[PDB]
Amino acid sequence: MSKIVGVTYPIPKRFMDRFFKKGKDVFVKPATVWKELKPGMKFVFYQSHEDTGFVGEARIKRVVLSENPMQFFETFGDRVFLTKDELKEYMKSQERWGRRRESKKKKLWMAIELEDVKKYDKPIKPKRLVPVGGQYLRE
Q1: Domain 1-139 is found in CATH 2.30.42.10
Q2: Domain of life, per the record (predicted)?
């Protein structure tokens, strides 16, 4: 339904564990998800395909909207799923391996506050495939 409930992401690296480690982490996006992403949803952490998907979930809260990703790494840093070291190699990886993902200007990045991070100790079978772009979980 249009009520939604949350979004689900596989997370491109092993930093799914971050949210379960500290119980409250910050997932950053270089503008990918649309206006369904509101403060007061859930964020289900997808694991892998086959019968073994969805490693856990959490609750989406106050999103910090800023054009510089380094704003999130000076404010949170430790609280963000990846570090600034992971950021700089990631952006380089997109522009040197992804043909030439460059830009004359910077874009609006978003830092989602993830609190109350729940765990699926049960292997939940995905109802559909969750790519790097991620899927909108709606009730």
Answers
A1: no
A2: Archaea
